[PDB]
Structures are given as C-alpha cells and as structure tokens.
Nucleic acid binder design. Sequence first.
DNA 1: GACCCTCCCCTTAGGGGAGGGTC
DNA 2: GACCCTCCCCTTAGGGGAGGGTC
Lengths: 276, 276
Amino acid sequence: KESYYSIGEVSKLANVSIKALRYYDKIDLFKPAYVDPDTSYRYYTDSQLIHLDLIKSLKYIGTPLEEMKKAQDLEMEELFAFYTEQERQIREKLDFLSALEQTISLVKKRMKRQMEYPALGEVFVLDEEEIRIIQTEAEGLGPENVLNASYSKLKKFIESADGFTNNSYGATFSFQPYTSIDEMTYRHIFTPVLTNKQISSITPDMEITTIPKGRYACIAYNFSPEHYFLNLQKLIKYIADRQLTVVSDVYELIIPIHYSPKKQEEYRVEMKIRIL
Amino acid sequence: KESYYSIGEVSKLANVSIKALRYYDKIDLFKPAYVDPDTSYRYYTDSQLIHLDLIKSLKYIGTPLEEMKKAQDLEMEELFAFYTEQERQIREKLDFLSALEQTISLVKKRMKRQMEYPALGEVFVLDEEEIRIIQTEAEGLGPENVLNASYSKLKKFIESADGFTNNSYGATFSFQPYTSIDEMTYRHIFTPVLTNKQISSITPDMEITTIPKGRYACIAYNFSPEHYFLNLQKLIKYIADRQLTVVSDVYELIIPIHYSPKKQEEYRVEMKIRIL
DNA sequence: GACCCTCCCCTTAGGGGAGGGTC
DNA sequence: GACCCTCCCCTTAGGGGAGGGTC
Ligand SMILES: COc1ccc(C[C@H](N)C(=O)N[C@H]2[C@@H](O)[C@H](n3cnc4c(N(C)C)ncnc43)O[C@@H]2CO)cc1
Ligand SMILES: COc1ccc(C[C@H](N)C(=O)N[C@H]2[C@@H](O)[C@H](n3cnc4c(N(C)C)ncnc43)O[C@@H]2CO)cc1
C-alpha cells in the first residue's frame, strides 16, 4: 500500500522466480516500479502486481515473451481475438499430435507383426491385410545394384506426408523359375505408406497402390547374401510342390533390425507372393 | 556403391540440411564413413544412409538428439518399448492441450459476457448461470485496505490446478443500508475457478463454493473511486424501490480492462446480488 | 544471518554468414 | 564456378552459481 514489495516478497507472492522477474525487467516486459539508485535493489508496488496475471496465463499457454508485450496493450475486444489465435494454433498442434499418435500406433502394429513371425527361413502361407504403398519403376535395378539412394524420391514423398520414414524398403519382381540371381530384375521398388494425409504434388512416375488382402506364401529370415537366393528358391519349390497358383509379383521387404552404427548392419527380409 | 557421397549429395538425397549433418557428426550421432585427412571433407557410404531413417523419424516425433543415441542401440523388442514411451508422452501433451483449449474457450466465454454488458452504471436484473469459485475469509478487509497480495493464496491454488490466472478478483459482503464505505467489511474474498482438475492439497481455510444459478440485480461500470459507493447505493435503492427480496451477499468482481503498463490502470467492476 | 545485487557460464538444434581452400 | 571446409555470432527463458555489498 504505502511501501514497496522487494523482489523476494513478490516472487513468494506471485509464484514467479526471482531470476524470472529480473529477466522480465531486463527485456522491459515487467519492470520494478522503483529502483533504488544506489543499491540497484528492485522495488514493486502492490497495484502493478496485476500485470502478472496476463504474463503468467500467457506463459502457461506458451505464448513467447516478445509476443506478450504486443498482447499487454490490447483492450478486451482486441485481446479476445488474440485468444482465438492461440486457440487455432492449439487445434493445429492437437491435429498434428492425434495424427502422430495414430502413426506411431501403426508403426508399432507393423513392428509386432515382425517379432511375431511364425518362424524364420521356413515357408508359411498366411492370410494378410493389405498394405498401401507407393512405388516407381525399378528402371533396370535388381538385387545386385539397388542402393538406398534409389529410394530417395519415394521416401521424399512419404516424408512430406507422413513425417515418419518407411522403416522398410520393398521391391517386387516376376515369379519365374529363376536359376540365378544374376537373372533377376525388379519390376518396381516401393515403400509402404502410413498416413492418409493426401500426398502433395505427387508425380506421374509414382504409382500409389497396395499389396492387396489375400493369401500369401511368405518366407522371412535375417539377411545374409548366401541365403537370399536360396530362400527364394525355397518359395519357388513350395509353390511347385503344392501345384499352387500364384497371382502377383513376388513382393520383398527389407527391415533393419537396428540402426546403431556401433553394431554390425543387420536386416530382416521377407518375401511373399499372393496365391489363389 | 564403390565411391562416396559428399555431404551435399547426401543432403539432397536425405532431405536433411548440410549444417544438420555437420552437427550430427559433431555430436557423434551420425558421422561421415570417411573423412579426407587433408581437406576435412566428409564422405558417406550408401549403406550408412539407413541410420537416417531413425534419426529423421525420431526428430519428427521430437525426441531430443542425446536420447536418439540411446535409441539407435535397441533391437526391435526394446525399441518397441521406446515407442510406447513416446506414445504416452504424447497422450500426456494432448490431455494437457485439450484441457488448455477447453480453458481458453471458457475464458473467452466470460470475456464475451463482459463486452456484451447491457449497459454501464445502470442496474439490470438478469438470469445468471452459476460461477464456481474458491474463497477465504476476508479477515477484516474491506474495499479500503484490500490489496492484490490479499489474493496471493487463492491465486496460488487456482494456478496449480488451472494454470490460468483468474482474470477477476471477487469479494462479497452483507447487503445493508450502507451510508458510508467507511462502514463496510468483506465477508469473503474469492476467485472464480475454471477447470475441474481436482485441486491438490486444498486447505481448510479455503472454501469451494459457487455463485449459484438465479436472478440477480447487477450493476457494472468502469471503476473510479467516486462511483464505487454511489453505484452501490443505486443498487440498494433499486431493491428498495421494487420491494425486492435479496437472498445472498452482494458479490463484486473486478476485471482489468487491459494489462499494459504504458496505459492508465483501468478496471471493470460489477456488483450483483441474488433475488427471489 | 538473510537478501539482494551484477555478471560470468550453460543448455537445444542448428542457420547465417564470413573468409578461406577445393572440385 | 561450385562446393565444401572451420569458426565466428545468434536465437528462448531463464537456472546455477560466484563474489560481492545490503538488510
Ligand atoms: C540394406 O539396405 C538396402 C539396400 C537396398 C535395398 C533395395 C532392395 N529392397 C533389396 O533387395 N535389398 C537387399 C539386397 O537385395 C541387397 N544386396 C546387397 N548385396 C547383395 C548380394 N550380394 C552381395 C552377393 N546378393 C543379393 N542381394 C544383395 O541389399 C539389401 C540388403 O542390404 C533395400 C535395403
Ligand atoms: C485493482 O486491483 C484490485 C485491488 C483489490 C481488489 C480487491 C477487491 N475485489 C476490491 O474491492 N477492489 C477494488 C476497490 O474496492 C479498491 N479501491 C482502491 N481505492 C479505493 C477507494 N478510494 C481510493 C477512495 N474507494 C473504494 N475502493 C477502492 O481497489 C480495487 C480496484 O483497484 C481487487 C482488485
């Protein structure tokens, strides 16, 4: 009333740290009514305390300080609108988070499917849900010369729309009595798509399609070069043996087991193909 | 394949800024396979490119870099769990935002009611919805000696639970044939409560109650000292004139018109009282 | 003994840009 | 001509703490 609060007294009173008050002073956001000209001590009036209501509420909303100065000024009608602004900045973040949560939940669903493989290196025929994908012509690439850079573009499209990177790298090819890896080419390469955020500015050299619901002969294993062809060969036999009728390319997918560079590179591979 | 990508080549390929790559190198998060010992030029292999999938996905989730190093290591089963962690950190933020949005939307509703006052300095009798509040005994305070610091405690309780600060400061008192402000004391002071976040560790010297749904004689005006008592007096007359029967304390509330300290302090005041 | 001062140094994740030396 | 290097300086909102001088 007829004396000043000292910075401590205010901080205790306002639930705002002493160092915060100095900062708000420094940046001319909230400043001592008085400053002792000899002790540099900061003194505060009871009535000026009200300005903190705004500063604190805003801070809690996460409005940045420089923005708060602009806000101090407005009278209610104008400050109402400011609030709407935050409200719409907040609906934005939520939308982005709900999206994010749904994505993770899917990435986790795809991951579970992996560690719940029925067995490795053995051929299992299973009933599968469809996996939306985007893909591009493999332009004379096969298993032998295909690089990560090959996927630069697909990834760039899925990143813009999903913000997550495909954990996994796919290619497809013709099911054929292959006698040598030497003699395979990929028809397409591709990656799976996770969200249904309409993908911006997609180009006519990318096709969006899916690996369709249906019965599949799969085999999966942890990659090493020797095994690659031989597992494929196993599949081929599996189908021939059962006189089974194939109805798609062979799809393959490659997933890293880890991303550490302190450990040896390791991948899970899975090969599948649709059958009647 | 049999040569290196240069930092530019990678950045273009990976949609990750050149300066970012240098940073990830600096902090041993992602590091050139090779560094030319004479040009300090950073060279990268096509296969190491995969580690970026994780870095980028994570970054997008907003996982902090130092955390990413820990994450690189885990094999799927362990990294699954990491994801759950984020998922639960995200459900947290949403909960906090939905809460935040609902609060703002209320603060805005209270604000509209203000600028849609029927008129100022005139007594209007209106049908009101209830306002939950928390309050404390005014310990011999009246209009003359009441300070902001008086509300230190209420505010501290509502801040912990709402995170917003009451825009408005309330007191109540006995409706009485007052002939002088000199002769009033507040029964309680109080502030309105916004959220229904259970308020932690509330103490027995605070009562939670509401200003109840009902018919009210109100007057509201922009404060100045002369007007304060005289408006009160008007209310008193209003009731006497209509032979109206009061059924509560007089409630008053004070709201700032602005929070700028570049402008003169200004408050809206409103006084009301419940009637049959 | 307690409180307040000023003035270091520190933290995230790079972007901008200057002032080289390389492809 | 283009690309890459290292090494300034900069940004949010203070917290920690040292090394005073004040209540
Ligand atoms: C690992 O990062 C990649 C690299 C390339 C791809 C593209 C493709 N899906 C694909 O077929 N990716 C797989 C493999 O086909 C291919 N690969 C690399 N080396 C060989 C090889 N020898 C060296 C004898 N024989 C057969 N395949 C080979 O590399 C990938 C596993 O490293 C996917 C992931
Ligand atoms: C503004 O910040 C405050 C300060 C105190 C309060 C407490 C209380 N609700 C209350 O009655 N707050 C109101 C007013 O009652 C009181 N007030 C301040 N000065 C006077 C006065 N004279 C100086 C003659 N006469 C009557 N009332 C006065 O200050 C507040 C408006 O400034 C609320 C807001």
